[PDB]
A paper describes a structure:
The vacuolar-type H+-ATPases (V-ATPases), which are ATP-driven proton pumps responsible for modulating intracellular and extracellular pH, are involved in many physiological processes, ranging from membrane trafficking and autophagy to apoptosis, bone resorption, and sperm maturation. Bafilomycin A1, a member of macrolide antibiotics and an autophagy inhibitor, serves as a specific and potent V-ATPases inhibitor. The V1 and Vo domains of V-ATPase can assemble and disassemble in vivo depending on various stimuli, such as growth factors, amino acid starvation, and increased glucose concentration; therefore, the V-ATPase activity can be shut down and turned on like a switch. ATP hydrolysis by the V1 domain can trigger rotation of the Vo domain, facilitating proton transport through the cavity between subunit a and c-ring.
Here, we report the cryo-EM structure of bafilomycin A1 bound intact bovine V-ATPase at an overall resolution of 3.6-Å. Six bafilomycin A1 molecules are found in the cytosolic leaflet of the c-ring. As the binding sites in c3c4 and c4c5 have been blocked by subunit a, bafilomycin A1 is not able to bind these two sites. The transmembrane helix 2 (TM2) of one subunit c and the TM4 of the neighboring subunit c create a composite binding site, accounting for how two subunits c engage one bafilomycin A1 molecule. Importantly, the hydroxyl group of Y144 forms a hydrogen bond with the 7′-hydroxyl group of bafilomycin A1. Y144 of subunit c aligns with F189 in subunit c″ and hence is not conserved.
Numbering used by the authors:
A (entry chain q), B (entry chain p): 5 to 155
C (entry chain c), D (entry chain g), E (entry chain k), F (entry chain l): 6 to 155
G (entry chain d): 4 to 351
H (entry chain r): 302 to 338
I (entry chain b): 2 to 205
J (entry chain s): 417 to 455
The structure:
Amino acid sequence: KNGPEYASFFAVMGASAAMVFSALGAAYGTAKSGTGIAAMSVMRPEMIMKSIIPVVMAGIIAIYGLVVAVLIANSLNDGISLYRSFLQLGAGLSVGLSGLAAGFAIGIVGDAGVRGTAQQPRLFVGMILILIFAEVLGLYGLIVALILSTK
Amino acid sequence: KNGPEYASFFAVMGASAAMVFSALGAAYGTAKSGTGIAAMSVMRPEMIMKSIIPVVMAGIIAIYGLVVAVLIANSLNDGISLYRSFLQLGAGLSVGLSGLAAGFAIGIVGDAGVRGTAQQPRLFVGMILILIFAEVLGLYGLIVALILSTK
Amino acid sequence: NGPEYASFFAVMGASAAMVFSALGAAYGTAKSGTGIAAMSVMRPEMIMKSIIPVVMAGIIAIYGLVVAVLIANSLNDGISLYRSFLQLGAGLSVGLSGLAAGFAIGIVGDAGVRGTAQQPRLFVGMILILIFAEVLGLYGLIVALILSTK
Amino acid sequence: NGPEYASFFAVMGASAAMVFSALGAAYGTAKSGTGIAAMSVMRPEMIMKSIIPVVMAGIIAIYGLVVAVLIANSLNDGISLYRSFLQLGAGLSVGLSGLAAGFAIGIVGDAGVRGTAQQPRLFVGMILILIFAEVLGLYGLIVALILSTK
Amino acid sequence: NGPEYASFFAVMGASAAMVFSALGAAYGTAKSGTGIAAMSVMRPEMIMKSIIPVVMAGIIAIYGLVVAVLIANSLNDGISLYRSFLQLGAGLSVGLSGLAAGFAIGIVGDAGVRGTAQQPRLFVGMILILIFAEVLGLYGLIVALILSTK
Amino acid sequence: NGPEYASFFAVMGASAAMVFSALGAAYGTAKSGTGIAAMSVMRPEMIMKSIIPVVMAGIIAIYGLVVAVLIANSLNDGISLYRSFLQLGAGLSVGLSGLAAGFAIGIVGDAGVRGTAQQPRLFVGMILILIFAEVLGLYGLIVALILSTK
Amino acid sequence: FPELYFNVDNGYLEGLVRGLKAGVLSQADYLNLVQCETLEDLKLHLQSTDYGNFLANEASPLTVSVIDDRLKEKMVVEFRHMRNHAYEPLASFLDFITYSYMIDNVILLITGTLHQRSIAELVPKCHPLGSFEQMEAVNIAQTPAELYNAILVDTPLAAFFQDCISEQDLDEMNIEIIRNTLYKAYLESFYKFCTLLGGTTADAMCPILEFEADRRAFIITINSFGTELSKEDRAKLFPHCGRLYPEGLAQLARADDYEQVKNVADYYPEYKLLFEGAGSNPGDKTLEDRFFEHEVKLNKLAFLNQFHFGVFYAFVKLKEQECRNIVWIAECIAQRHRAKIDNYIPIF
Amino acid sequence: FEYPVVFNLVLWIMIGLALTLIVTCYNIWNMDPGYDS
Amino acid sequence: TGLVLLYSGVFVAFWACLLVVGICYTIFDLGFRFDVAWFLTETSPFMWSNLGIGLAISLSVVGAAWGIYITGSSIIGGGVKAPRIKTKNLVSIIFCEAVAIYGIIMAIVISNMAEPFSATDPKAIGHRNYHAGYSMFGAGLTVGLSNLFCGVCVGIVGSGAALADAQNPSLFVKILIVEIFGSAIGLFGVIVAILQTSRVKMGD
Amino acid sequence: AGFFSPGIWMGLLTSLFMLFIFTYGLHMILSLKTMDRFD
Ligand SMILES: CO/C1=C/C(C)=C\[C@@H](C)[C@@H](O)[C@H](C)C/C(C)=C/C=C/[C@H](OC)[C@@H]([C@@H](C)[C@@H](O)[C@H](C)[C@@]2(O)C[C@@H](O)[C@H](C)[C@@H](C(C)C)O2)OC1=O
Ligand SMILES: CO/C1=C\C(C)=C/[C@@H](C)[C@@H](O)[C@H](C)C/C(C)=C/C=C/[C@H](OC)[C@@H]([C@@H](C)[C@@H](O)[C@H](C)[C@@]2(O)C[C@@H](O)[C@H](C)[C@@H](C(C)C)O2)OC1=O
Ligand SMILES: CO/C1=C\C(C)=C/[C@@H](C)[C@@H](O)[C@H](C)C/C(C)=C\C=C\[C@H](OC)[C@@H]([C@@H](C)[C@@H](O)[C@H](C)[C@@]2(O)C[C@@H](O)[C@H](C)[C@@H](C(C)C)O2)OC1=O
Ligand SMILES: CO/C1=C\C(C)=C\[C@@H](C)[C@@H](O)[C@H](C)C/C(C)=C/C=C/[C@H](OC)[C@@H]([C@@H](C)[C@@H](O)[C@H](C)[C@@]2(O)C[C@@H](O)[C@H](C)[C@@H](C(C)C)O2)OC1=O
Ligand SMILES: CO/C1=C\C(C)=C\[C@@H](C)[C@@H](O)[C@H](C)C/C(C)=C/C=C\[C@H](OC)[C@@H]([C@@H](C)[C@@H](O)[C@H](C)[C@@]2(O)C[C@@H](O)[C@H](C)[C@@H](C(C)C)O2)OC1=O
Ligand SMILES: CCCCCCCC/C=C\CCCCCCCC(=O)O
C-alpha cells in the first residue's frame, strides 16, 4: 500500500501549478485589461465602473485555481500511491494551463473591448459575450480537474 | 520515520523561493509604478502622497512571502521526511510565483493608473478597485501556502 | 513478439503522422485564408473560385489520417521492435513532409490569390504551381504506405 | 545477426531522405512561387515559361523519393548494424543536400524571375544558375546510391 | 576487426563532406546569383561573363563529392576505429572549410558583380579575389586526401 | 601503445587547424573584398593595390594548412593519449588564433581600402596595421609547431 | 509567424484603421460630388458620406479655404487617436510618419529665424501632425539659428541633423537643400526601421518606400535644369533607398536633359509607361499626375496583406489624397472652371 | 551510493545560478542610461 | 532579439552538450549505460497516462483561447465603425470554442481507461499496462496539439473574415467555407485519438 | 549509481515540462508594455 518516498512530489507539484499558472493568467487579464481602463478613462470617464468586468472575469480565473489547489492539498496524505499522486499532477496541469490561456484571452479581448466600448457603446453586450466564451474555457479545465483529483 | 540526508534541500528552497520570488514581484510593483509617480509629479504635485497606494499594495506582496518563509524555516528539523519537505517546496512556489504574478499586475496597473489620474481625477476610485483584484492573487497564493506548510 | 516498451514507437508514429500533418493543414488554410478574406473586398466574384488552395491544404490533413488510422489499427500489444520502428519512420515521413507541403501551399496560395485579384491571368498558373506543392505530401504518403505495410 | 534497434537508423534514412528533400522542395516552390505572382502582374505572357524554377524544385523531391524507396525495400528484420549505418547516411546525404539545393533554387528562382520581368535577356542566364543549383541535388543522389547499395 | 559502432563515424564523414560542401556551394550560388539579377538590368552584356562566381562556387560542390565517393569506396564491414576516425576528420575538414570557401565566394561574388555594373575594370580584380576564396576549399581538399588515404 | 579511442583527439586537431583557419581566411577575403567593390567606383586605379588585405588573409589559410599536414603526418594506429592531446591543442592554437587574426584582417582591411578611396596617404599606414593582425596567426603557428613536434 | 502574434498589442487598432478605409470615398461618391454647382451644395452631398456634419458650424458664405482647413483637421484627429492608443512596436512606426511633417515645419521655423521672427508663425502656419507643442524650448528660441540648432537636437529630428551642421543652415545652404538632405536621411532611416520589422510589414511597405525614393530621384533631377546647383549637389539629394540606387542614380546625376532621364526610366518597365505624361498635348495628365496614380496604386495593395504595420501608413497617404481630391472638386466648383474637374485620382 | 542525488543537486543549481548570473550581467552591460548631455 | 537569445542559447548549449556526450558514450564503450529500455520501463505508466489527460484539455484550450483573442480583437476593433459585426461574426468564436469541446470530451474518455495496479517489476507490469500508458500519452498529444493547431487556424481565418464583413456585409457567408475546412482538422485529431485508445485497458 | 535514478527521471520530466509552461506564461507578461501618452 505504501508507495515510494518521492511519491508526494508530483501531487504538490500539481497543487503548486494549479495556483501558480492560474495566478499568471489572472495577472495578465488584470494588467492588460487594466491598462485599457486608463486609456478610456481620459475621454469617457463615466464608463469606468461598467468596464471593470474584464478584471472581474479575470479574477474568477484565479478562484478556479484556488479551488483545485485546495482540494489537492487536502487530499494529500503521507505515503500516497504513485497512481493517486499523478492524478493530481494531471489535475494541476488541466486547470493550470487552462487558466493561463483563458486568462490571456480575457486580457486581449478585455483591453480591446473597453477601448471599443468607449467609442461605440453598442459593443458592450458584444464584448461581454466574447469574454463569457473565454471564461468557460477556464471552467473546462476546472471540471476536468475535479474529475481527476477526486478520481 | 527519519528522512534521508538530502531531504532538507526542498524545504529550504521553499523558504528561499517564498522570499525570492515575492520580493521579485514586490520590486516590479515598486519600480514600474514608481516610474509613474515621477511622471504625474511634473504636472499634478498634490497627488503624490495619495498615489503611494500602488506601492503600498506591492508592499503587502513582500510580507506574504515573509510570513511563509518564517512558517517554513521554523518547521525545519534535521531528518525531516521527504514528504514533509516536498509540502514546503510547493508551499514556497505557490506563494512566490503567485506574488511574482501579482507584482507584475500591481506594477502595470499602478503605472497606467497614476498616469491616468494626472489627467482624469475620477480614475483614482477605479485604479484602487483594480489593485484590490491584483493584490488578492498574492492572497490566494498565501492561503494555499498556509494549508500546505502546516500539515 | 517484442519487448514491453516496444509499443512506444508505434504510438509516436500514429501521433506524429497526425500532429505534424495538422500543422501543415492549419498553416495552408490560415495563411491562404488570410489572402482569401483580403482579396474578396476588391474582387467579390472570384471568392469561390479561389477556395481551391484551402481544399488542397485539406488533402494534407487526410494524407495524415490515412496513415494514422493504418498505424493505430495494426498496432497490437507487443509488436516487434522492427515493426514499431517501421511505423515510427512511417509516421515522421508523411507528417514532416506534409508540414512542408502545407507550408508551400500557404505561401503560394496567399501570393497566388493576391496576384489573381490584381490580374485574372494567373489562375491557370496558380493551380499549376499548387500541384507541385501538393505532390510533396503525396510522395510522403506513398513512402509511408511502403514503410507501414511491410 | 544484428541487434533489434539496428532498424532505427535504417528507417531514419528512409524518413530523412523524404522529409529533408520535401522541406527543400517546399522552399523552392514557395519562395520562388511568390516571385511568379509578383512578376505576372506586369508580365502575364511569361507565366507558363516561369514554372521552370518550380519544376526544377519538384525534381529535388523525387530525388529523395527514389532513395527512400531503395532504403525501405532493402529492409529486413535483424539487419546488421553496418548496413543500418549506410542507409542512415544515405538519407542524410540526399536529404540535407537536397535541402541545400532547394535553398538555392528558391533564392535564384525568386530573384531570377524578378529580373526576367525587368529584362527578357536574363531568361537564359537564370536557367544556367538554376542548373548549378540543381546538380547539388544530383550530387547528393549519387552518394546516396553509392552508400545504400554497398 | 573494429567494433560495431566504428562504421558510424566513417559514414558520417562521407555524409558530412557532401552536405557541408553543398551548403557552401548553395550559399555561393544563392547570394551571388541575386547579384546577377541586380546587375543585368543596366548592363546585360556581362551576364554570361558573370557566371564565374557561380562557377567557382560550383567547384566547391565537387571538392566534397570527390571525397564522399573516396570515403564510401573504402568502407568495409568491420573497419578499425583508427581508420574510421580518419574519414570523420576528412569529411569535417573539406566540408567546414568548403562551407567557409562558399561563404566567402557568395559575399565577394555578390558585391563584386554589383560593383562591375558601374566600373568594368573591377571584373579583372573581382576574378582575382575569387581565386583566393577558391583555394580555401582546395586547402581542405588536399588535407582530406592525406587523411583518407592513410 | 595506447587505447583504441586515442586517435580521435589528434584527428580533431588536424581538422580544427584547417576549418578554423579557413573560417578566418573566409572572413578575411569576404569582409575586405566587399570593401574593394565600394572603393572601385571612385578610384579604379588602386584595384591591384588593394588585394594586399586579401593576400594577407590567404597567408592565414596556409598557416593552418602547414600544421594540419604536420599533424596528419604524425598519426599512427595506436598513439599514446598524451601525444594525441598535444596535437588537439596544436590544432586549436593555430585554428582559433587564425580565426582571430583573419577576423582582424577583414575588419581593418575593409575600413582601410574605404579610407584609401578618399585619401591615399592611408595606404602606407593600412599595410602597417595589417602586419600586426598578421602576426597573431604567426604566433599561433609557432606555438602549434612547439606543441606538435614534442 | 507574425500572424499568430500581432493581435496582442495591435489587433484593435488594425481593425480601426480598416474601418476608416470604408470611409474613403469611392468612385460613386466622387460622381455625386462633381454634379455639385456651389460650395453650399457640396456641404449637402458630403453629408451622405462619413464626413457628415463637419461643416455645419462655420459660416453661410462657404469658401474653399474653410473646406480645405476643415478636411485636414479631421485627418489629424483620426491620426492622433490611433497614436494615443498605440503600443511601442507600432508607436515607433507612427512617429516615423510624422517626421515628414516635422521636417516641413522645422524648415518653416528657420526661415522666420533668419528673417528675425518668432512663435507667431508656429501655431497658425504649421501642419498639426508634425507639431511642436511639447519641447517648449523650441517655442521660445528667438536665437538666430545657432543657440536654436542646439535646441533642435532636443527633438526627435536630432538623428537626421548629422549632415547639417549649424553653420550650414546659417545662410550657407539654400532652404531646399536643407529640406531634401533631411528627407534623404529620413527615408533611409525609415527604410532600415521597416526592415528590422520583418515579415509582412517589410514586403508591403518597402515597395512603397522604394517608389518614394524614385519619385524624388526623378522629380529632383527634372526640376534641377535651369537652377544653379551642380551635379555633385543633386547627387547628395538622391535617397539611397530605391530601385535606381547603384545604376539609375549614377545616370541621373549626369542627365542635364529631359530626354536623358526618359531613357534611364526605359530600363525599368514600371517607370516607363509612367513616363507617358507627355505634356506637349494641351489637355492630359502630366508626369506628377501619373506619379500620383502610382503612389495610390501601391497604397491600395497594402490593404491586401493583413498582419502588418503598412496598413497605417497607407491610410495617411490615402486620407491625404482625400484632402487633395475634394478640395480640387471644390476649387473647380467655386471658380466654375469644371472642364478639368475629372482630373482627380479615383482612389476607391 | 547517492551519486545521482549529488550530481543533480550540483548540475541544476550551477546552471540555475549561471543563467541567473548571465541574465543579470546582460542587463547591466546593456543599460542604456541616455547620454548626450 | 533579446530574450530569444536566451532560448537559443539554451537550445544550442543543450544539443552541443548532447553532441559531445553522444560521442563519448560510444567512443569508450559505454553504450550499454544509455539504456532507453530502462528509461521507458522504470518511469511509471501513470506519468505518461496523466501527461495525456493533462495535455488533452489544457493544450486544446490553449488553442481555443489563442483563436478567440486573435479574432475577438477584430470583432471589437472592426465593429467600432460597423457595429453589425458583433452578432453575425460570433460563429467564428464558436468554431474555436468547439475545439475545447473536443478537448474536454477526449480528456474524460481517456480518463475512464486509467485504473490502478499494484505491480512494480517491468515483467509483472506486462506490456498491456505499458501499451496503455504510452497510448494515453499519444492520444492526448494528437488531440491536444491537433486542436492547438486547428483553434488558431479558425482564429486567423475568423479574424480576416471579420474584417471583410466590415467592408461588404455579403462576404461573410462565403469566407465561412474556409472556417469549415479549418475546423475539420480538429475533428481529425479526435478520430485518431479514439482509435489509439480503442483496445486499451489498464490495470490488473 | 549512475547519473540518474528512475525517481529523478520522472521528477525531471515534470519539472522541466512545467518550466516550459512557466516561461511561456512569463514571456507574455514580460511583454505587456504600457502607453506613453493619454487622450
Ligand atoms: C513610514 O510608514 C511606512 C512604513 C513601511 C516601510 C512599511 C510598512 C508600514 C508597510 O509595508 C505595510 C505593509 C503597509 C502599510 C499600512 C504601510 C504604512 C506605510 C506608511 O503609511 C502608509 C507609508 C507612509 C508614506 C504613508 O503613510 C503616507 C505618509 C500616507 O500617510 C499618505 C496618505 O495620503 C496615503 C494615502 C496613506 C496611505 C498610503 C496609507 O499614507 O510609508 C512608510 O514608509
Ligand atoms: C552546362 O554545363 C555547365 C555546368 C554543369 C552543368 C555542371 C557541372 C559539372 C559544373 O559543376 C562543373 C564545374 C563544370 C563547369 C563549371 C564547367 C565550365 C562550364 C561552362 O564553361 C563556362 C559553363 C557554361 C555556363 C558556359 O556556357 C558559360 C556561358 C561561360 O562559358 C561563358 C563564358 O564567357 C564565361 C567566361 C565562362 C567561363 C567560366 C569560362 O562561362 O557551364 C556549363 O556549361
Ligand atoms: C471590492 O472588490 C470586490 C471584490 C473582491 C475584493 C474580492 C474577491 C472575492 C474578488 O476578488 C473576487 C474577484 C470576486 C469576484 C470574482 C467577483 C466579485 C465581484 C464584486 O461583485 C461584482 C465587484 C463589483 C461589485 C464592484 O467592484 C463594482 C462596484 C461593480 O459592481 C459596479 C457595477 O456597476 C459593475 C456593473 C459591476 C460588475 C461586476 C457587474 O462592478 O467588486 C468587488 O466588490
Ligand atoms: C501540373 O503538374 C504536371 C506534372 C507533374 C505533377 C509532374 C510531377 C510528377 C513533377 O514531379 C516532376 C518534376 C516531373 C516534371 C518535369 C513534370 C513536368 C510536368 C509538366 O510539364 C510537362 C507540368 C507543366 C509545368 C508543364 O507542362 C507546363 C505546361 C509547361 O509545359 C509549359 C512550358 O512552356 C514550360 C517551358 C514547360 C517546361 C517548364 C517544363 O512546362 O504539367 C503537369 O501537368
Ligand atoms: C595564384 O594566385 C595568386 C596568389 C595565390 C593563390 C597564392 C596562394 C598560393 C597563396 O597561398 C598565397 C597568398 C601565396 C601568395 C602570397 C601570393 C602573393 C601574391 C600573388 O602573388 C604571388 C598574387 C599577385 C600576383 C597578384 O594577384 C596581384 C595582381 C599583384 O601582383 C599586383 C600588385 O599590385 C599587388 C600589390 C601585389 C600584391 C597584392 C602581392 O600582387 O596573385 C595571384 O595570382
Ligand atoms: C538554486 C537557485 C537557482 C535558480 C534561481 C532562479 C531565480 C531567478 C531570480 C532572478 C532572475 C531575474 C534577474 C533578471 C532581472 C530582470 C531585469 C528587468 O526585467 O528589468
